[PDB]
Amino acid sequence: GSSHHHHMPDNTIQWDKDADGIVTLTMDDPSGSTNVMNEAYIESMGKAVDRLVAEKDSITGVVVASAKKTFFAGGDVKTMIQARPEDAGDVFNTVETIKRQLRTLETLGKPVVAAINGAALGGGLEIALACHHRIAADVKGSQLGLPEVTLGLLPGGGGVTRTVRMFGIQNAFVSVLAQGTRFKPAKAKEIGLVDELVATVEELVPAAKAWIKEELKANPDGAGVQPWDKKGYKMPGGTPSSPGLAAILPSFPSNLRKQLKGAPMPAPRAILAAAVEGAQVDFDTASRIESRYFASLVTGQVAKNMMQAFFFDLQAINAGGSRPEGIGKTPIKRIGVLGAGMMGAGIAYVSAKAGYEVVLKDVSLEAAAKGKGYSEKLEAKALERGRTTQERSDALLARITPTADAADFKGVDFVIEAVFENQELKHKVFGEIEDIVEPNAILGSNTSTLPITGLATGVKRQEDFIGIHFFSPVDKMPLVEIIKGEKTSDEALARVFDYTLAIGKTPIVVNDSRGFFTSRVIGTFVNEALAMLGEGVEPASIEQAGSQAGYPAPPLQLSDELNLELMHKIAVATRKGVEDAGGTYQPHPAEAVVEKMIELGRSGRLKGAGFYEYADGKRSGLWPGLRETFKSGSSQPPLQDMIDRMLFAEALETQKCLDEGVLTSTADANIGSIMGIGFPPWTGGSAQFIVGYSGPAGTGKAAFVARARELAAAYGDRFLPPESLLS
Amino acid sequence: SEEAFIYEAIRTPRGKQKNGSLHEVKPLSLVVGLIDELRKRHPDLDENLISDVILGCVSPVGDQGGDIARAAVLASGMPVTSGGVQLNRFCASGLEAVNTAAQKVRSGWDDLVLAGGVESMSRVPMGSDGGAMGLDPATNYDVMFVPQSIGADLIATIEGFSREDVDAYALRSQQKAAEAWSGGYFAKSVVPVRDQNGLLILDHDEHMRPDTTKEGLAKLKPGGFDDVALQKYHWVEKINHVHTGGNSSGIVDGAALVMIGSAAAGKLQGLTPRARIVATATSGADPVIMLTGPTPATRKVLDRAGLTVDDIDLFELNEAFASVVLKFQKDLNIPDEKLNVNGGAIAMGHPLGATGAMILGTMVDELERRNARRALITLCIGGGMGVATIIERV
Amino acid sequence: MSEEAFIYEAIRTPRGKQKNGSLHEVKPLSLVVGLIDELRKRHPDLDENLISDVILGCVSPVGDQGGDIARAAVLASGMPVTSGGVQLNRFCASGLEAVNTAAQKVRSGWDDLVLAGGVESMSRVPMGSDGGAMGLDPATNYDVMFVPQSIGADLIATIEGFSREDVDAYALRSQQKAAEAWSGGYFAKSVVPVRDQNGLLILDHDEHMRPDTTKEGLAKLKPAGFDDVALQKYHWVEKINHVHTGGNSSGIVDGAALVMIGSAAAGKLQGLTPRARIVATATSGADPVIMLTGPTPATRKVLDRAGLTVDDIDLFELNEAFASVVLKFQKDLNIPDEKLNVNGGAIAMGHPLGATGAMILGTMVDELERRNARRALITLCIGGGMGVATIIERV
C-alpha cells in the first residue's frame, strides 16, 4: 500500500544508535565502490526508515553518513534505460517510494543531519536535501549537484521540489536544475546547498551529532522542521500567483527556448514545468507532479539516447575500452610542441594547465612568443573572473618555454606537431628534432586529413609515430582523436591515451584512414548546407535548421571558421584517394558552391569575408550579396527536411566508418561525434541517432531506414542506407 | 430567420493611461453611465423586454471580475430578468458581444439585447488575470508564445514596411481623429463621464496628440522572444523593430454599449433602427505572428454575405499596430480613403474589451453622416484569432 | 432561427473532491484538453477545421483559468487555429449558457460546428478568486443588498416550510440515485477518466459521493450581518431557519465537460449521428436577494417558448445547489418525484461551477437514450437572481 518498500537484495545501510539516541545511518553498498540509488538501497532505507518510526520514542536525532570515498552518487541507470513506455507506472512508483522514505525522514520530528564525506551528486544530493542540516568535508574531488538533466532526466527524488522550496523557482532552475551544475563544497555552502564545512571527514559525524545536541537545546520547537513545513512560509521570489513573479514568469519558457535554440531536448522543459507547477500546490502534491514528469522523461527516447551516450558509452571509454590491454604506464616529463599557431598554443596551454612542462617551438622566437601569449590572455580572463589564483597562474605560464632552436627539444619525451597541413613539411619538421628528443619520445601529429602512415615514413622510429588530433579552441574542445598508423605500436596508443585523460580530455582510437572520423563526418554536415545553399534555400533557413537540429554552431558559420581552402583541399584529396582504384568519385554538389565563394574572394573568417561579414574581426550578419548569388528563396523545402538532411548525412557517414573499420566501437562514434565535431547531445551520438531516431515514420533503426530512403528519393542517393543497417 | 438591427451605439471617452481622467472611475461606473444615457434617450422603453446584457472584458479580475455585466444590471436598477454575462475573446470581445447578441436575436430566443464591452486598463492592466498560455511552462513552450508587438514588427519586416511607413499611418490616424472631433462627428455618440455630483471628469479622448508631426514620431524609441519568433519564421534573418508608442494602439480606459433587437422588438418599443447586421464571421491564422487573423475573417464575412471589396463603403480595422492595418490594406487592396476614415486606436486608444463595440458604433455614425450603405468592421486578436462584421445602413 | 441545432457528443470528467482531491494536481487546462483528445479518439476522421468556435463557461477565470482558457485549449490541444475559443461567465449556468450560445450560433447559420462546455477547478481556483465588481465596491454592495446563496436557500426553506428533515431527505435521495446510476453503468461511456502525461489513472469516478449516507448522519451536521440584511428586504419574516449543511448543499469539486453542437448538414458531412435536438432555450430571473428562485420563470418561459407543458417533459434536471431550491422548484411546478434528478445531483457528485451546466445536460442525453424517453428539461439557478433553462428532444 502506502509503503516504504517497492517489491532478497543485500542490506546497504548500517544502523548505530548511541547512548544519546542519535542514530547514525551509514550507507555502504557492498556490491560496488559507490552508493547508488538502486533496488538494494531502496529496500535498505525502507527498513531503516521503518525502524526510525518504530523506535521513535528512543531516538533524538539522525545522522546520515557514508563509508565510501564519496557520499552518494546517482541512481540506477541500468534500470531506467530499460524502462519502456508500458513500464511508466513502475518508474512512477519507484521514485514515489523513494521520496516517501525521504519525506518520512524529513518529517520525523527530530533533526536529521547529512555527513557529506565526498561527492553527493544527483540522487546523492537529493538524500542530503531531505535532511535539516548539511555538513560537507572540504576535500579534493568532492562535488555536489543535480546533474540529472545531463542524462536527459530530472531530479525526481525531490531535487526539483526542494531546491524550489529552498531558493524559489528562478534561482533553483537557473543555478541548479536547468544545467546540472556541479559545485565544490565551498561554492555549495555559498549558494545555500550546504550549511557548514569541516576540514576533514573525521570531524563530520562528531560535528553532526554536536549540531543535533545544540539544535535540540537552542531550537526545541523548530528542531527537525524544514522551512516549508513551518507555517508562515514564503517562497523566495514568490509563488506563480505572486504579482512580482507572475510578471516575469511567461518569459522563462521563451528564454529557455532561446538558450536551446529550438533543439528538441525535453528534459529542461520538464524541469521548468515541474518547478512551476510544484510551486502552485503543497509540498506533497508538488513531489507527485515531479514524479510524473520524471517517468515521462525516463520512458522517452532522448533520455535513453543521453543515458546511453553520457553514462554507458562515456564510462566504457574512461574505463579504457579502446586502450590496448596489457600495456602499462609511462611518465611524461617534457612536452615538445612544434608550431605556435592557434592549435599549438592551445595544446601548449592545456598541457601546461595539467602540470606538464612544455617547450613551444616555432620558426622564430617572435612567433613562439605570440603562441605563449594565447596562454597569457586566457590566464588574464581566468584571473579577471577569479577562477585561478595569481600563484598558480604564474606557475602555469612558467611551464611554457617559447623557443626557435631545435636544440631546446632536448629531454622531450612527448612530441606534438601542429604545423601547416602539408606532408613534406611535416616530414622536414620531424626530421630535425627526431634525433634531439628522447629515444622513446612519442612522435605525435595534429593533422586533420593526411594519413598517419604516410607521415610516419618521415621518421626512423615509426613505431612511436601516432596521430594526436585536437580541435580548436583546444582550451575548450574536450576530445582528442587518436589515429593509429599501420606502424604505430600499441604502447604509443596507450601512452597517448593516458596523456589525453591526464590533460582532462576524452580519447577515441581511430584506425588510419583518409579524413579519419571527425574530419570526414563533419565534412558531410557542411557539404549538406552548402548544397542547400546552391539548391536555392535561404541562408537564414539553413542556419536555423542547424541551430534547431541541436548543433552548437550553424553550418555556414562553421564553414567560415574552417575556411574553404582546407575545405576545398579535402575535395581534391578525397577525390584521388579512391580515384586510383577504378573507383568513380562522384563529385558532391557542394563543390560548386565552395569554388564560387573562393572565386568571389570570400573564403572564411581568416580572409575576413565568407558567408557572413566580419567587421574588425566580429561576425555581423549574413553577407547580403549571398541571396543574389545563389538565387536564395527559389527552393523552400520543409525545415525538418533540412534538419534531417544534416543529421542523416553525418549518421550515415558514421555507419560507413564503423563498417570500414575506421571505428572499433559505437561508444567512440557517439562520444567522438558529440565531443569532437559537435553532434547534438539529444541524439546520443551519430551512431545512437540511428537506433533512437523518432519521427512520423516511428522510432528505431527501421524508422531511420524509412526516413533515410524518403530523403534519398527527394535529395539524392547519398541518403540510401548501407547494407549493414538493413534486415 | 429574424433580422438583427442596431438601435443605439454609444461609448465613453477614452481616458489615457498615465494621469488618466478615468483612473479614479471604477469600470462598473463606466457601464452604468452608458445605461443611464440610454434611459435618457428612451425613458418610455420597457426595460422588461431587455432579455440579456452581454459585455466583453479581457481582464475580468478585481474591479472587472464577478460578471461585471450582471453587476451593471443590478447596480443600474435594470430588471433582474435582464441577464448579464461577461465574455473574453481577447481584442474582439467587444465585437464578439455584438455578434453574439445579433445571433441570439436571429435565433428568435432573444428579443432585445444590450451588448458592448468595458476595459479599465489603468486599473486592471492586461495580464492581471494570469492564464495558461503564459503561466504554464508546459503549454507555453509548445504554442510559441510571443508578444504581439514582435509579430507586428515581423509583419513590417516581411511586407517591407519601413519605420517611415508605419509612422506615416500613425500621423494619418491622429489627423483623421482630430478632424472627426472638430467636425462634430462624435458629438452624439461619446457620452461624457461625470461623478456622483454631476461634476465633469472627462469628455474627450485624452490619448489623442493632434499636434503630431512626422519628425516627432521619428524621435520615438521602439526574454528570448525575438529568437522564438525567428525559430518559426526561419527564412527571416533579423526583425526590423519599427513599432513605438506613437504607431501602436494606446492603453486607455473606456466602455461602449450597443442595443440590438429584432424589427418587431424595436417597433414595439418605439425605436428607430439605424443599421442592420448583415453577416458575421470568425477565422484565425498563425498565433506566433498573432496579427494575421483579420484577412481570412474579412474574406469569410464577404463571401458569406455575397459581397466583394467594391461593395463596401467603409472599412474599419482596429489600429492595434500600424503594420497590421498596412498589411490588411495591402492584401485586400482597400482604397486609402475608405480605411479608418475617422482615425483609430493609435490616436484614441484601445480599451481591449470595449474597442470592438466602439469602432462598431463609429461606423454606424459615419454611414449615417455620409449617407453611405455598407461598412465592414474587423479586429485582430491575441492568440491568432479574428472577427469581422458587415453592417448596412437603414 | 432556421437551422436546427443537434447534440452530437456530450462527455465530462469525473468530479474530484475539494480536500485531498485526486484532481488537485491537474491543471484546469488539462481537464479540457483531455476531453478534446477523447472526442478525437471517438471520431478520428473528423475534419477539425469545420469546428468554428470553442465556447467554455468559467466563473473564476483567473490564474490557471485566466487568459481565455477556451483559446488555450484550442492551441494546447493542437486544434486548427481557426477554431477560435472564447470564455464566458454567467455564474452557475455558465456551462449551459455556453451550450445555449453554441446552439443559437448554429441557428443563426453563421456557425457550423461548435464545441461548448465549461471548466472549473475549485480546488486550485476557489470561488471568488476573481474579486468582483460588487464585492470590491461598497457603494454598489450597500445598494444592491448582496447576500450569499446559502442564506437565500435557508430563507427559501423558511418561507416554504421545508424542515431540516425535509432538506436532508432530499440529500439522502440524491446520494442514493447517484450511487444507483454509477452502479448501473449509466455513466460508463460519458465520464472520461483523467490520466497524466504517462497514461496513468488519476480519477475515474465522482469521488465526492458518500453512498452510505444515512438520515442520522445528516442530522448531526452543523449549518453553514447577512442574516439581518436579508430580513431588511423580507421584513415580514422574523427568523431565518438555517437548515442547510455540507450534506444537503452542492459539493465543491474540480471538473470539466464538453458538448459538441452543430447543424444537421454539419454532422452529416462529418459522419456524426445526432443524439438529441435543442428544442428551446430561455433566460429569466427573480429576486437578487433570495438569489435562488431564478429557475422557475426560466422553465415556464422555455416551456411556453417550445409550446409544451410540464406533462410533456419526461425528465427534469435541476442543479442541486441547495436542497430547498429543488424542493421549491418541485413544489411550484408539481414535478413528479420520479422525474426529478433521476441520477442524483450536485449534492452527491459536486458542482464544478462553470462546467456543471454542460455536465447535467449530457447526463440527460444519456438517460433519454437509456430510458428511450423523448424530452428532458435542464435548468440551473444563478447568482444575482438569474436563471437558464433548456429543452432537448431525443433523436
Ligand SMILES: Cn1c(=O)c2c(ncn2C)n(C)c1=O
Ligand atoms: C522565403 N520563404 C517565404 O517567404 C515563406 C516561407 N513560408 C512562407 N513564406 C511566406 N518559406 C518557407 C520561405 O522560405
